[PDB]
Amino acid sequence: SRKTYTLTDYLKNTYRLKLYSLRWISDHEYLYKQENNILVFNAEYGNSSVFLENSTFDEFGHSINDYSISPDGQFILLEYNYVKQWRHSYTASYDIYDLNKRQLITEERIPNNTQWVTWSPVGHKLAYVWNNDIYVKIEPNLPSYRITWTGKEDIIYNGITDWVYEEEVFSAYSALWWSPNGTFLAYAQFNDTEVPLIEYSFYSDESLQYPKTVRVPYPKAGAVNPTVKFFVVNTDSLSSVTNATSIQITAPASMLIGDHYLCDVTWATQERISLQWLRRIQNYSVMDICDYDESSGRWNCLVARQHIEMSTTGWVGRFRPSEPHFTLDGNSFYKIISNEEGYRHICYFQIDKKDCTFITKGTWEVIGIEALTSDYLYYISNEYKGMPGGRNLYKIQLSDYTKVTCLSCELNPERCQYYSVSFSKEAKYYQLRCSGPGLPLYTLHSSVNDKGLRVLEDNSALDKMLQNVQMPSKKLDFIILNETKFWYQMILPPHFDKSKKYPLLLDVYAGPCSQKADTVFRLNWATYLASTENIIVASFDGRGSGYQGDKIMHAINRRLGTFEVEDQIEAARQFSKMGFVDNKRIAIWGWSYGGYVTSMVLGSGSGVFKCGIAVAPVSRWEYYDSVYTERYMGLPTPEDNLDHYRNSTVMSRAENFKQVEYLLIHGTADDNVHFQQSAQISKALVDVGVDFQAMWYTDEDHGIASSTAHQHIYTHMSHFIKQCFSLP
Ligand SMILES: COc1ccc(-c2cc(N3C[C@H](c4cc(F)c(F)cc4F)[C@@H](N)C3)ncn2)cn1
Numbered sequence: 026s027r028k029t030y031t032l033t034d035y036l037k038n039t040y041r042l043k044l045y046s047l048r049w050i051s052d053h054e055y056l057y058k059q060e061n062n063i064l065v066f067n068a069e070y071g072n073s074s075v076f077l078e079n080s081t082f083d084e085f086g087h088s089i090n091d092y093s094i095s096p097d098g099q100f101i102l103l104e105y106n107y108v109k110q111w112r113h114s115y116t117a118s119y120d121i122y123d124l125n126k127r128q129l130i131t132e133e134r135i136p137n138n139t140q141w142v143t144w145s146p147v148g149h150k151l152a153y154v155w156n157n158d159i160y161v162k163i164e165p166n167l168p169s170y171r172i173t174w175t176g177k178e179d180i181i182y183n184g185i186t187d188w189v190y191e192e193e194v195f196s197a198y199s200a201l202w203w204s205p206n207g208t209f210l211a212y213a214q215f216n217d218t219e220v221p222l223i224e225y226s227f228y229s230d231e232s233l234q235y236p237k238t239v240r241v242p243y244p245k246a247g248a249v250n251p252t253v254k255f256f257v258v259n260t261d262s263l264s265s266v267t268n269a270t271s272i273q274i275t276a277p278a279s280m281l282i283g284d285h286y287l288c289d290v291t292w293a294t295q296e297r298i299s300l301q302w303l304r305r306i307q308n309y310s311v312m313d314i315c316d317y318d319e320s321s322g323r324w325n326c327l328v329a330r331q332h333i334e335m336s337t338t339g340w341v342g343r344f345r346p347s348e349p350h351f352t353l354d355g356n357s358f359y360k361i362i363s364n365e366e367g368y369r370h371i372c373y374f375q376i377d378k379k380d381c382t383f384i385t386k387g388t389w390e391v392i393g394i395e396a397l398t399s400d401y402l403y404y405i406s407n408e409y410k411g412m413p414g415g416r417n418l419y420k421i422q423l424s425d426y427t428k429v430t431c432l433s434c435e436l437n438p439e440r441c442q443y444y445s446v447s448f449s450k451e452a453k454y455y456q457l458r459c460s461g462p463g464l465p466l467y468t469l470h471s472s473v474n475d476k477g478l479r480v481l482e483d484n485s486a487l488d489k490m491l492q493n494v495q496m497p498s499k500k501l502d503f504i505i506l507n508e509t510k511f512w513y514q515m516i517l518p519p520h521f522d523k524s525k526k527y528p529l530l531l532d533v534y535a536g537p538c539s540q541k542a543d544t545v546f547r548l549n550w551a552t553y554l555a556s557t558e559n560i561i562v563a564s565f566d567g568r569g570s571g572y573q574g575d576k577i578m579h580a581i582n583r584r585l586g587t588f589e590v591e592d593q594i595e596a597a598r599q600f601s602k603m604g605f606v607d608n609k610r611i612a613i614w615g616w617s618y619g620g621y622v623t624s625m626v627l628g629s630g631s632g633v634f635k636c637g638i639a640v641a642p643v644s645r646w647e648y649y650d651s652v653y654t655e656r657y658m659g660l661p662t663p664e665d666n667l668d669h670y671r672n673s674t675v676m677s678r679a680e681n682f683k684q685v686e687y688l689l690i691h692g693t694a695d696d697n698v699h700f701q702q703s704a705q706i707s708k709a710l711v712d713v714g715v716d717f718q719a720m721w722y723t724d725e726d727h728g729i730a731s732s733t734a735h736q737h738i739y740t741h742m743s744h745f746i747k748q749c750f751s752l753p
């Protein structure tokens with residue numbers, strides 16, 4: 026048809042997917058921001074009113090980064106002065122604005138460089154972390170209560186996580202959990218005293234004459250890890266004159282005999298907390314249930330309430346143990362667990378009883394449980410049509426497990442196969458969000474008889490624009506390795522002609538529990554490559570991949586760098602035997618784990634690939650952090666798994682790169698996958714006389730996400746691909 030989807034279109038966000046981000050504030054109302062107004066919507070009728078005009082803060086004098094309205098409507102938190110730290114951490118300033126009095130609170134303000142602020146879940150108490158210590162404000166205009174006195178930069182963290190807990194365990198900076206009531210505040214304390222530091226140079230603005238050395242406690246594989254403690258404070262009995270009493274909850278005997286992690290914290294009732302702990306050998310976990318004792322003011326954890334979840338074939342959970350969903354009474358809960366055959370299904374547990382009752386089964390997986398009411402459990406799975414890369418909402422009747430209703434499967438089957446959901450409080454209403462394979466579609470629904478109420482956002486604007494672009498298509502299908510089905514996706518150029526040979530770029534992640542073949546709709550680099558440059562972009566899910574059971578997922582156990590790499594080479598050979606692929610023009614590329622896979626494939630000597638790009642790769646597992654590495658790899662000791670640590674490096678394959686054109690890219694301020702990793706790759710290739718191309722990105726981290734760098738890397742990569750494929 027007409028213009029194609031260009032690199033610039035991608036780089037400059039020319040064709041924008043619209044979203045419908047709402048925030049539930051009750052069982053029947055949400056907040057939504059429709060151009061410099063906050064609107065409140067009524068879910069049942071769809072009427073709205075303006076909550077707050079942005080004009081309110083025209084003369085506030087600071088650019089407001091975000092906001093948080095107190096659950097009771099009384100106050101809004103204003104976040105400005107935002108400074109990114111790692112993936113989820115950042116610091117900021119905070120002003121509180123009283124919505125009834127229509128004025129800023131000017132007394133007893135939150136300090137600058139506050140690390141974390143949370144409202145209680147009810148009312149308007151605040152808890153915040155400043156200088157690695159926790160402070161609680163009962164009223165926003167009143168002086169705070171200091172909870173901890175031990176916070177120490179780089180060493181003791183109260184209520185916030187250190188580097189590896191942020192990245193690998195909680196996926197959050199916060200380590201503060203209010204009870205449902207707001208009576209108790211639970212928090213974790215991390216101790217990094219002997220964790221070694223990664224050090225790297227930060228060059229900063231050109232005006233900085235001497236570069237800065239950034240130092241971060243970061244346990245690489247096998248190193249000393251942070252230790253953790255857990256504490257609960259009663260915030261309804263705090264004194265101005267007497268220091269706050271925090272009650273410690275210790276980890277079970279079965280954990281305390283060695284290194285372990287706190288891997289999950291979930292309140293069950295107003296006086297019951299559940300804690301999951303994990304051994305540093307991540308094949309064994311324990312859930313504790315801890316009940317408050319009114320008489321002593323302490324927390325007791327009966328050994329008979331401990332639930333064990335262990336694996337005999339791999340590790341526990343997909344990334345970590347799944348979280349429990351408690352019945353309103355707190356005497357039982359639902360959790361996703363791997364069943365006798367390897368499939369992740371919902372299990373029913375009652376608190377002072379042994380076993381558990383599986384309420385789903387089949388050759389598919391539950392992705393997550395989304396809501397629990399007295400009659401139904403709402404969950405997301407990939408059962409529909411046996412497509413591991415599709416996602417649908419279901420409900421199961423708690424009085425009869427055979428009564429499962431798919432709630433999303435047939436709302437719009439050609440356009441919609443990949444749903445997520447957001448339930449109101451008490452799950453009276455839900456927003457469904459489909460992400461593919463058509464354009465995203467956002468809808469509101471009522472849980473009573475599962476009636477559609479309202480289309481929220483249908484992306485009709487974007488639909489119309491794309492009718493005007495020569496858009497590529499997605500093929501989603503499967504091949505067979507060894508009597509098992511493995512799924513792959515292909516991005517095909519517009520006006521695809523199977524009697525012509527196309528160049529193929531293999532897009533790789535292939536990390537454990539990854540999935541790269543799915544029904545999601547994306548506008549990305551592959552879109553450009555297929556639409557303008559007529560390259561087929563393919564992605565393949567082999568051994569190690571997720572959402573198809575443990576047999577596939579755990580094939581890679583103690584063995585990273587093997588089956589997941591072979592499987593990509595094999596997928597490529599099978600793509601090249603289908604007759605529309607030019608087998609003298611196959612390339613490969615990947616980021617993070619995919620850059621480790623790309624390098625191991627280029628270094629395999631297979632002869633399949635002409636060229637490849639590795640961005641921020643791992644090169645050797647001893648360099649990456651302990652929590653993630655040791656999950657898949659055990660420990661790099663001779664009593665454990667040192668030999669496969671040494672056989673799984675990129676560097677050992679250096680000679681083989683003389684058969685391929687390789688482009689290696691890394692940001693110098695990468696705090697996650699250290700520049701060290703690529704420095705050691707380059708050094709091995711030079712020692713062996715292999716020529717290659719490189720690019721460093723000064724001061725960029727693992728996402729290489731600053732917008733000029735993002736643009737420059739995708740541009741640099743597109744030239745490399747064009748040249749390797751003799752494309753004009
Ligand atoms: C419910 O809590 C969950 C659930 C899922 C995940 C999760 C983690 C994850 N990771 C990939 C990342 C990573 C791995 C590399 F090999 C690498 F080179 C760089 C890199 F950033 C790991 N730090 C963690 N990827 C997808 N999902 C994390 N938390």
Ligand SMILES: *[C@@H]1O[C@H](CO)[C@@H](O[C@@H]2O[C@H](CO)[C@@H](O)[C@H](O)[C@H]2NC(C)=O)[C@H](O)[C@H]1NC(C)=O
Pocket residue numbers: 065066067070072073074
């Ligand atoms: C949706 O419409 C209803 C009905 O007009 C609003 O309900 C009224 O709300 C105001 C403030 O809550 C009350 O003083 C009225 O007396 C209510 N009347 C009735 C008949 O319900 C509701 O406020 C609207 N909701 C939104 C979100 O704008």
Ligand SMILES: *[C@@H]1O[C@H](CO)[C@@H](O[C@@H]2O[C@H](CO)[C@@H](O)[C@H](O)[C@H]2NC(C)=O)[C@H](O)[C@H]1NC(C)=O
Pocket residue numbers: 306308309335336337338659664665
């Ligand atoms: C959890 O961690 C380790 C590693 O897989 C297991 O300990 C090994 O047990 C196997 C049994 O197949 C022995 O052959 C090895 O000699 C042990 N290796 C080491 C270094 O300890 C342990 O079995 C796992 N636990 C579970 C529940 O399966």
Ligand SMILES: *[C@@H]1O[C@H](CO)[C@@H](O)[C@H](O)[C@H]1NC(C)=O
Pocket residue numbers: 206208295296
């Ligand atoms: C919240 O729970 C605590 C402990 O059960 C109790 O003391 C307090 O009264 C509760 N707050 C409410 C619901 O008013």
